[PDB]
Design a protein around this ligand. Structure first.
Ligand SMILES: C=CC[N@H+](Cc1ccccc1C(=O)NCc1ccc(OC)cc1)Cc1ccc2c(c1C(=O)O)OC[C@H](CCC(=O)O)O2
Ligand SMILES: C=CC[N@H+](Cc1ccccc1C(=O)NCc1ccc(OC)cc1)Cc1ccc2c(c1C(=O)O)OC[C@H](CCC(=O)O)O2
Lengths: 149, 149
């Protein structure tokens, strides 16, 4: 559980926002990309796994699950690549709610930057720091530290 | 201490590698950029502070310290922007050594990717996971978790 992440792809302004969610905490990293290719996804996972102890990634769709470039990145970074089938139906709902919340935050900041990428990084910051009371940033560190110990 | 980071800029292949080091742990994030502008530095700090609890950043040079774009990003993200004067002379040595280590690792992986950015992210992964016995990734999580509790 401390090492489980889920990929999520959402769309805004004719661009793609790729999101990785740490399942147990709700902490996220995200990036804007032109389109969701195997290479973009592979590079994103490489970045993520260099920054956090990524044991398993539930991929966001079958194309990323199939992609040999994505499999190659997961091999390189020691990540177990898995499907993202919502065996628990609550998973779809959680992802959908997160995309809605993220788009809400982007709207709230959208006028503070010219470029969508900047707004998305502001949204990451706000999401990770929001207290609901601990924040997702606090939760992820505590979960992982407990695991190390 | 748990919230203090240091910026560092090094050069390779006619490109700039911008690095943020978590001082207490030696954990790093890095990106390749064409040149080290206020806007590039500002965007990098925005990303960093959305991901880790960044209290203070020692800037890497006077241009980044002066930059109103960098100051604005620090304001946005709640970061105390500071100079990077090595009042402890051991600081220059530590940075120099880290740049040498990073370039060594990049050399070791350089043939595994076409693009420097890929090699740099591989280098981040190797550096953060290397056991020195705990890794820098373990140390940062432990330091921050201890602070939270
Ligand atoms: C078909 C893939 C292309 N190469 C093949 C290659 C070219 C030359 C030498 C070795 C290889 C090789 O297969 N090594 C094993 C490997 C596989 C996956 C992997 O994924 C992390 C990293 C490494 C690897 C690569 C992937 C994603 C990238 C890259 C690059 C690159 O070559 O640098 O460059 C930046 C780009 C940014 C995102 C975007 O622009 O889409 O993401
Ligand atoms: C003179 C700066 C340009 N704007 C001014 C702007 C334009 C329109 C509306 C508001 C503003 C405004 O001042 N808001 C307050 C503010 C200041 C600093 C800040 O720092 C994170 C974020 C927000 C902000 C900006 C900075 C770095 C970027 C950006 C953008 C952007 O406008 O989206 O876009 C991507 C780029 C990527 C790295 C690269 O390509 O160099 O980094």
């Amino acid at each position: 559980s401390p090492g489980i992440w889920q990929l999520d792809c959402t769309h805004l302004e004719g661009k793609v926002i790729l999101v990785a969610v740490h399942v147990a905490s709700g902490y996220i990293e995200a990036e804007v990309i032109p389109a969701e290719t195997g290479q973009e996804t592979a590079y994103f996972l490489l970045k993520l796994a260099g920054r956090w102890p990524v044991k398993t990634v539930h991929t966001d769709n079958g194309s990323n699950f199939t992609s040999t470039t994505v499999k190659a990145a997961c091999w390189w970074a020691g990540i177990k690549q898995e499907d993202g089938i919502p065996y628990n139906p609550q998973s779809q709902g959680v992802i959908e709610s997160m995309n809605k919340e993220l788009k809400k935050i982007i709207g709230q900041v959208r006028d503070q930057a010219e470029h969508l990428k900047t707004a998305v990084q502001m949204a990451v910051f706000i999401h990770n720091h929001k207290r609901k009371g601990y924040s997702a940033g606090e939760r992820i560190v505590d979960i992982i530290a407990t695991d190390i110990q």
